[PDB]
Design a protein around this ligand. Structure first.
Ligand SMILES: CCNC(=O)CN(CC)Cc1ccc(Cl)nc1
Lengths: 237, 300
C-alpha cells in the first residue's frame, strides 16, 4: 500500500528499493514574446531515482531535445520518467533488480505500472510523505551536470557521500531529508549554513562538506532552526 | 407465439419475464406464460417472497425447444426443463390456455424496448459465457462470479465474459505504452474487434448481456463487465461511425430501462463522466447524454 509515517522503517530493510521523483523532469523558464505574449523555453532536467539505503542516486539527465515537436509536455514527462525507470530496471539482471519502486507523486503510478508489465515482481507504490526531493537541483554538483549536458546521459552519485561508514541508513536518510527540506524552504539560508566555515571543504567528488560528527550536529540543528523559522515568517507565529 | 408452462407455483415468488413481472401467491393457481414473442432471446427470473437474496433466472430462445418451469422442493427453486415429447407439450399447453391459467406476455406494440435491449444478444454466445451444455437454456443468479473476478472460486458456475484489462500486455503494445493507454483504438479495433469478437455485433451482444444480468440479478461482476466494454470504446479515439451510432442507441435504452432508484450502485460515475464529458466520444453520444442529464443529473 501507500508509504507513510507508520511503515517508515521498511525503507531500510534488506530489500534494495528505489524512490522515483519526477518534479525536475520538465523545466521551463517563462518569458515574453515580442508581440507581448508569453512563451516557455525548456531547460535540461533529470529523473531523481535513489536507493535510500546505500544512497546511490541514478541521476538520469533529460535533455531538452526530447521535448522537440511534442505536445502536452507535462503529461509526456511522466511517461518519459516511466520509460527511463523501466530502461534502468531492464539493464539490471533479476537478482540486481530492485524489490519496490515508490513514486513521490501519485500521477506517476499508472505511467510506471504500464511501463512495468515486463517486471511482475516489482510493486509500484505511492507515499503520503511530502518528501523534499524537488530541492535536488539546489545541490550545486547535481545542478551543474544537468545544465551542462549536451545529450541524454545517466550519471551515478552516492547522495550520502561516505556517511555510511559512520552512521546508519536511517540516520543518513533523515539527514538528507532535513538538508533538502532546508534547501527547499529558503535556499539562500540553507546554503549559507553549509558553506559558512571556509575550512570545511566540499571536495570536488562530494555534494556535501566533510563535516565531523560534531559539526554535523551543529549543522543539523541550524537547519532545524531554519525550517522552524521560515514556517513562522510564512504564517506569523 | 410461444409458451413457457409452469407445473405449479408452490411458494410465494415474484416472477419476471423480460422487463415484466408479477406477484404470485403461495399455491396460487399459475401455469405459465403465453404469447412470448418468437424471434428474440428471453429471460425468465425469480425472487422468492421469503429470501430476496438470490435473484435467479434462465436465458432461453423458444426456437431451440420447448421449455417449462417446475419447482424443485429438494433444491428449493423454480427449475427450467426441456420437454422433448412435442405432443406431450402441445397438449399440456393447450389444456392450460383453455382453463386460462396463463398470464400473457404483456407486449405493447409501439414498444420496441426489449428488441432494443437484446438486438445483438444470441443464445449461442450466451451459452459460451454460461457453460452448462447439456441444457439449451442458461442459468444465472445474483452471486455468480466472473472468470476475471476468480482471478484476483467454483468455475462450473462462473460467467466466462471476455477478459478486458487496460493495464495488461494484451492491451499495451511494447513501445507504444503512452499511446496505447491514453488511446485504446489498437486494443478495441485490432485486439478485440478483429481478434476476439470478430465483429461489433458480438461485442455489442456481450455488452448487452452483461448489462441485463446486472440489471435483473444485480450481478456485480456483470456490471463491471458492462462498464468495461463501454470504457474501452469511449477511451478509443478511432471508432467506426457505425459503432458509435449504435452504441449511443444501445446505452440510451439501458439507461431508459433502469430502475430510477438503482442508479447509485449500477452506474459507475467515473466511466460515464469519461464517456460523456472527457473521452474522445464526449460529442458522439447525444441520445445517451440527453437522457442521462435529464434523468440522473446528480451523478455528474
Ligand atoms: C537500482 C538498483 N541498484 C541500487 O539500487 C543500488 N545498487 C544495489 C543493486 C548498488 C549499486 C548499483 C549500481 C551501481 Cl553503479 N552502484 C551501486
Amino acid at each position: 500500500g501507500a508509504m507513510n509515517s507508520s511503515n517508515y522503517a521498511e525503507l531500510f530493510n534488506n530489500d534494495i528499493k528505489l524512490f522515483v521523483d519526477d518534479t525536475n523532469v520538465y523545466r521551463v523558464t517563462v518569458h515574453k514574446t515580442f508581440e507581448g505574449n508569453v512563451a516557455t523555453k525548456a531547460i535540461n532536467g533529470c529523473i531523481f531515482t535513489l536507493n535510500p539505503k546505500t544512497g546511490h542516486l541514478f541521476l538520469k539527465i533529460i535533455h531538452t531535445s526530447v521535448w522537440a515537436g511534442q505536445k502536452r509536455l507535462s503529461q509526456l514527462a511522466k511517461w518519459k520518467t516511466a520509460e527511463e525507470v523501466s530502461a534502468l530496471v531492464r539493464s539490471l539482471p533479476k537478482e540486481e533488480q530492485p524489490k519496490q519502486i515508490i513514486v513521490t507523486r501519485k500521477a506517476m503510478l499508472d505511467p510506471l505500472e504500464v511501463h512495468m508489465l515486463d517486471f511482475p515482481n516489482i510493486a509500484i507504490r505511492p507515499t503520503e510523505l511530502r518528501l523534499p526531493f524537488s530541492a535536488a537541483m539546489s545541490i550545486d554538483k547535481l545542478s551543474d551536470v544537468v545544465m551542462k549536458a549536451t545529450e541524454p546521459q545517466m550519471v551515478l552519485f552516492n547522495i550520502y557521500d561516505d556517511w555510511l561508514d559512520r552512521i546508519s541508513s536511517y540516520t543518513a536518510f533523515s539527514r538528507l531529508t532535513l538538508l533538502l527540506r532546508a534547501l527547499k524552504t529558503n535556499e539562500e539560508s540553507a546554503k549559507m549554513i553549509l558553506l559558512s566555515d571556509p575550512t570545511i571543504t566540499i571536495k570536488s567528488y562530494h555534494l556535501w562538506p566533510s563535516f565531523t560528527d560534531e559539526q554535523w550536529i551543529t549543522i543539523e540543528s541550524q537547519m532545524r532552526d531554519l525550517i522552524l523559522t521560515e514556517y513562522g515568517r510564512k504564517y506569523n507565529v | 407465439m410461444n409458451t413457457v408452462p409452469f407445473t405449479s407455483a408452490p411458494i410465494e415468488v415474484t416472477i419476471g419475464i423480460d422487463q415484466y413481472s408479477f406477484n404470485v401467491k403461495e399455491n396460487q393457481p399459475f401455469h405459465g406464460i403465453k404469447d412470448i414473442p418468437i424471434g428474440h432471446v428471453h429471460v425468465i427470473h425469480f425472487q422468492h417472497a421469503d429470501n430476496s437474496s438470490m435473484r435467479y433466472g434462465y436465458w432461453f430462445d423458444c426456437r431451440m425447444g420447448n421449455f417449462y418451469i417446475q419447482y424443485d422442493p429438494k433444491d428449493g427453486l423454480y427449475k427450467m426443463m426441456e420437454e422433448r415429447d412435442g405432443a406431450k407439450f402441445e397438449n399440456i399447453v393447450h389444456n392450460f390456455k383453455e382453463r386460462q391459467m396463463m398470464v400473457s406476455y404483456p407486449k405493447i406494440d409501439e414498444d420496441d424496448t426489449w428488441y432494443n435491449l437484446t438486438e445483438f444478444v444470441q443464445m449461442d454466445k450466451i451459452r459460451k459465457i454460461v457453460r452448462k451444455d447439456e441444457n439449451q437454456f442458461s442459468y444465472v443468479d445474483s452471486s455468480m462470479t466472473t472468470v476475471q473476478e476468480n482471478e484476483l472460486s467454483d468455475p462450473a458456475h462462473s460467467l466466462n465474459y471476455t477478459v478486458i484489462n487496460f493495464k495488461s500486455r494484451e492491451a499495451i503494445r511494447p513501445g507504444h505504452e503512452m499511446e496505447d493507454f491514453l488511446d485504446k483504438s489498437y486494443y478495441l479495433n485490432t485486439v478485440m474487434l478483429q481478434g476476439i469478437f470478430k465483429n461489433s455485433s458480438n461485442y455489442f451482444g456481450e455488452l448487452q448481456f452483461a448489462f441485463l444480468n446486472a440489471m435483473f440479478f444485480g450481478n456485480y461482476g456483470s456490471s463491471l463487465q458492462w462498464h468495461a466494454m463501454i470504457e474501452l470504446i469511449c477511451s478509443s479515439a478511432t471508432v467506426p461511425k457505425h459503432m458509435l451510432d449504435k452504441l449511443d442507441e444501445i446505452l440510451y435504452y439501458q439507461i431508459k430501462t433502469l430502475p430510477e432508484q438503482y442508479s447509485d450502485i449500477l452506474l459507475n460515475e467515473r466511466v460515464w463522466n469519461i464517456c460523456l464529458y472527457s473521452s474522445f466520444q464526449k460529442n458522439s453520444l447525444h441520445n445517451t447524454e440527453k437522457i442521462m442529464e435529464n434523468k440522473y443529473p446528480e451523478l455528474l
